[PDB]
Ligand binder design. Structure first.
Ligand SMILES: [Zn+2]
Lengths: 620, 72, 186, 187
RNA sequence: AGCUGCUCCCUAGCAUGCUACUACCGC
RNA sequence: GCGGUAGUAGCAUGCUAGGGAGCAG
């Protein structure tokens, strides 16, 4: 917290790696033998060795991923398109990458207009399209990091809020795992820069035996490995013309962060009934369980939701460090202390200040989270809970104490200020007390920055707990953004669930004998997915069919909507699947001369198949 | 009526893009801009004038033999 | 599946057991036909099971490869289908502002720039003949894109400015006819 | 499964069975040739069905080790490629100025964002519009990073050569305008 | 050309389990 | 007449592996 302030005075040209010219096989290299953070000071390598004879595979791997010898052998770059600090240009001509428009699937549109859709003045119309972008699209979005400013945090309150946020995460378990326990779904993704020149992650996950990975993962507990990160544009349907950028980290970061964090990560994704709800599914009556969990026992509830404007770039650097520390607070036995500090330093040197290779030239990322590393979806949740607890503290302290009549929250206020500023060490009695008060009056539900809060209302009206203005104030003076009161809603009749959560509305319908909550989507989204596609494979339904099955699965709960022009979407999808099937059979019959001897496909074009997926009896 | 305009604008930009029109940066920038205005339009008249302005780009070229593809 | 050899043996065994149960003579002589008929459905539902799955195997593989053939034949013709689909939608659109310029381009009036939409700003429309001139330009006003433009800078193809009053039928075969008639919107 | 010690024995048992069935002497003959087909069947039970599983096992092992051999070949190829890339990109950096800038460090560890600054032999400017062009790269020579650079080979978005006289004020709207000026380090 | 999480569909394999038919063995 | 084992076929469940597609952050 002090280094973040005393570093905005020194030149920003003397940061990053602290490379030095070492000798190998009689040849001078340039390798990074340390680092210089803004917030952690100078950090020195421990196992650096001059005069090496031959390099192993681990040495070649760690010497092909550092930016030192990459930048140090490239032409200078002075870029006036941005304000972010450029570094160098490996190539000799910048590359401009554009974004193509999506393709049109006309036959479904003809079917839709046949049935009386898209009539002028209807409640269902097209809004989600495949927008296009010009040449300098990527850099015009990477420039958005100018919303990141060096921020100072009130440390005497952070060292209470971090305790409460940690107590929110006590039910779980984590630790380091060996090479023979990692789980890697879809092992054919890109390997970052410069590895993507040779093959996908399969080659680098194969050529390394089960001890090379462990030798590396135990090497980075005494060293620092700076890495380069590529930036890519997404190609997806959207409701706004702004492009999206995602960071493809190099393999040397994930290959060790997985082994570090996986136990905790897969311990959170397999727990039901907690505050964080990553992993819990909305099918087979799971959404109802979430919604009844949040309503748990609060007295006079009123809901409240929000979402953060451009969360990944506006986030300061202190909150990211705190999130990583709260995530690493469980290795009390597997790692001693210096291993943990050097692992934190490696994390901050990989996904908080790395050298972004936007386009064809290295840049410098000032701060904010990189959205494509191993632990975005959980760090965002930790930071969100921090914001919630900060708002609660600010709302409870800043209140005229002679006006409060409940003789018990006055004592909470008094001891809260006492433990906040006066004292110096933990007060786990009072931390437990405050956590109990919070979970009793501020029930919560979290995903990566998409939150829902159910609170007692006859308190928030007196400022005894958070409100919606308090998050505005906290975001203002800490996250350095303005929370426009058109992205955060507020509901008052819990009979209707949240106005929007995970971009799905909630409806209370009759299932069997009882009443359930189903999430229905935005109908324009479903129709836009029907019409607009990529490639050419999908302008012909016969080749795919299955995507229509999945979309009809997703677009089912509109069938119980009182608005007429919603159920017709589902019915149209059913009829289109039927037409697709019985024209595929005819085409195969006329090319060949027999048909599909048996299919049992009728279930696909009847509602019995789709009804099964919203009833509480799992049949996986 | 407007939905027809949006769909045909998508198709028009597709054919233009595969017509190697993105090799002239200012031309591609104008085309992309016009596409994004058409898609975000809320009334039918400015959609149609931007539509004809966009069609003029394809018409100016000599790659799409017009008297054939309008065989009616 | 009845045209298999084992079905005949099964039928003979079934007829034998039908005769036995219709006579009901012995206890062991019919029991022979539970050691010779209960076997008869062992080389029958073993031979008539694998072939039935082979049928659906062949069907599924054929459908997969038919879909692959269609997928390879579709993504190799996009730059004809896109244009056909576009023009069908355009003639379905039915807007005069479009039809005007489409017909004009079908006979030759191809603009040499993006048609400007402001009340100001410049336009240049190639005109290769005289009969085309008759319909579009009348006096000083230029009719194009269902708009009213003002004629200012008629010029021939050898980059020589040609005056407006000169344009007539008899003296028309005196000019480099690909005129570039610059104009401005109303 | 036709050339095993058991095919001969089962064939002999069934040959005796058929020979004495055509003879058809006694009921005990039928009992013996049934209790012979009911034991020599065990012979064709295990002699031709457990060895039918060893083939599956052996094929599985052989393909597994084939796959592992390919796995260990790809490693050699990627190692060679990476080491060649390292040794060919090193060749461009070792100017004497790098030695002069490192030998003067108190320790030998210099920051990374100052190596290209004081050693690069070519600068690349990117200008969005003429207004920024006038305050950065006007004329044939300009100074950045406390050095002196001279301009050559100005290009644009389409990467076509553009001479220096073209970029006036009025001619500017006729140029693809992420202009990329590259300059050399004058001395 | 990113990191997760949920869901559908197809095939393969092993194991488990269940059921039916045949053979052997004593009881 | 029972049991057990060895077989063969059918069926179910589940777990792993491989492939295709869709939604949410
Ligand atoms: Zn550990």
């Amino acid at each position: 917290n002090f280094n973040v302030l005393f570093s905005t005075v020194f030149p920003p040209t003397s940061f990053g790696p602290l490379v030095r010219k070492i000798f190998v096989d009689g040849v001078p290299f340039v390798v990074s033998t340390g680092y210089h953070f803004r917030e952690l000071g100078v950090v020195h390598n421990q196992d650096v060795n001059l005069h090496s004879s031959r390099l192993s595979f681990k040495e070649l791997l760690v010497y092909a991923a550092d930016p030192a010898m990459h930048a140090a052998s490239g032409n200078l770059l002075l870029d006036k398109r941005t304000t972010c600090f450029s570094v160098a240009a490996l190539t000799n001509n910048v590359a401009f990458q554009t974004v193509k428009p999506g393709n049109f699937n006309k036959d479904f549109y003809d079917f839709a207009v046949s049935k009386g859709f898209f009539k002028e003045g209807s409640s269902v119309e097209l809004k989600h399209f495949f927008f296009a972008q010009d040449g300098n699209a990527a850099i015009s979005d990477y420039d958005y990091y100018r919303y990141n400013l060096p921020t100072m945090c009130d440390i005497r309150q952070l060292l209470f809020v971090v305790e409460v946020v940690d107590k929110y995460f006590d039910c779980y378990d984590g630790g380091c795992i060996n090479a023979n326990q990692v789980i890697v779904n879809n092992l054919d993704k890109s390997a970052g820069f410069p590895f993507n020149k040779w093959g996908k992650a399969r080659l680098y996950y194969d050529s390394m035996s089960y001890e090379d990975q462990d030798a590396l993962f135990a090497y980075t507990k005494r060293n620092v490995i700076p890495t380069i990160t590529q930036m890519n544009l997404k190609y997806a349907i959207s409701a706004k013309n702004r492009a999206r950028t995602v960071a493809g980290v190099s393999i040397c970061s994930t290959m060790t962060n997985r082994q570090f964090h996986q136990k905790l990560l897969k311990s959170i994704a397999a727990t039901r009934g907690a505050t964080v709800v990553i992993g819990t599914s909305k099918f087979y009556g799971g959404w109802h369980n979430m919604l009844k969990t949040v309503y748990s026992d609060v007295e006079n509830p009123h809901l409240m939701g929000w979402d953060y404007p451009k969360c990944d770039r506006a986030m300061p650097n202190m909150l990211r460090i705190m999130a990583s520390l709260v995530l690493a607070r469980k290795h009390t036995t597997c790692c001693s202390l210096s291993h943990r500090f050097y692992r934190l330093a490696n994390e901050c040197a990989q996904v908080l200040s790395e050298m972004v290779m936007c386009g064809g030239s290295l840049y410098v990322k000032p701060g904010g989270t990189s959205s494509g590393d191993a632990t975005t979806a959980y760090a965002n949740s930790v930071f969100n809970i921090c914001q919630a607890v900060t708002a609660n503290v600010n709302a409870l302290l800043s209140t005229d104490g002679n006006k409060i009549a409940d003789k018990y929250v006055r004592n909470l206020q008094h001891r809260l200020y006492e433990c906040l500023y006066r004292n110096r060490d933990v007060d786990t009695d009072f931390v437990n007390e405050f956590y109990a008060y919070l979970r009793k009056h501020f029930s919560m539900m979290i995903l990566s920055d998409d939150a829902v809060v159910c609170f007692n209302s006859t308190y928030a009206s007196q400022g005894l707990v958070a409100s919606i203005k308090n998050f505005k104030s906290v975001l203002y003076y800490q996250n350095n953004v303005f929370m426009s009161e058109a992205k955060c809603w507020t509901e008052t009749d819990l009979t209707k669930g949240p106005h929007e959560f995970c971009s799905q509305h909630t409806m209370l319908v009759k299932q069997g004998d009882d009443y359930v909550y189903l999430p229905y989507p935005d109908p324009s989204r479903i129709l836009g997915a029907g019409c607009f596609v990529d490639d050419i494979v999908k302008t012909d339904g016969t080749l795919m069919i299955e995507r229509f099955v999945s979309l009809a699965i997703d677009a089912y709960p509109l069938t119980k909507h009182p608005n007429q022009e919603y159920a017709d979407v589902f019915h149209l999808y059913l009829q289109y699947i039927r037409k697709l099937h019985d024209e595929l059979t005819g085409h195969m019959l006329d090319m060949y001369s027999v048909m599909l001897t048996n299919d049992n496909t009728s279930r696909y074009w009847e509602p019995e198949f789709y009804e099964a997926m919203y009833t509480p009896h799992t049949v996986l | 009526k407007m939905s027809d305009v949006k769909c045909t604008s998508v198709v028009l930009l597709s054919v233009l893009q595969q017509l190697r029109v993105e090799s002239s940066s200012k031309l591609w920038a104008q085309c992309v801009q016009l596409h994004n205005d058409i898609l975000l339009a809320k009334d039918t008249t400015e959609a149609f004038e931007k539509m004809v302005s966009l069609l003029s780009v394809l018409l100016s070229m000599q790659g799409a033999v017009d008297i054939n593809k309008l065989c009616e | 599946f009845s045209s298999l050899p084992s079905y005949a043996a099964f039928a003979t065994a079934q007829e034998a057991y039908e005769q036995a149960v219709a006579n009901g003579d012995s206890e062991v002589v019919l029991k022979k036909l539970k050691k010779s008929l209960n076997v008869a459905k062992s080389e029958f539902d073993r031979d008539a099971a694998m072939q039935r799955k082979l049928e659906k195997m062949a069907d599924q593989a054929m459908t997969q490869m038919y879909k692959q053939a269609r997928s390879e034949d579709k993504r190799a013709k996009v730059t004809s289908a896109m244009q056909t689909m576009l023009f069908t939608m355009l003639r379905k659109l039915d807007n005069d502002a479009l039809n005007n310029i489409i017909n004009n381009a079908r006979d030759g009036c191809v603009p040499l720039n993006i048609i400007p939409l402001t009340t100001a700003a410049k336009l240049m429309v190639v005109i290769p003949d005289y009969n085309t001139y008759k319909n579009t330009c009348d006096g000083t006003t230029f009719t194009y894109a269902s708009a009213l433009w003002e004629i200012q800078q008629v010029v021939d193809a050898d980059s020589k400015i040609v005056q407006l009053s000169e344009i007539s039928m008899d003296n028309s075969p005196n000019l480099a006819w690909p005129l570039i008639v610059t104009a401005l919107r109303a």
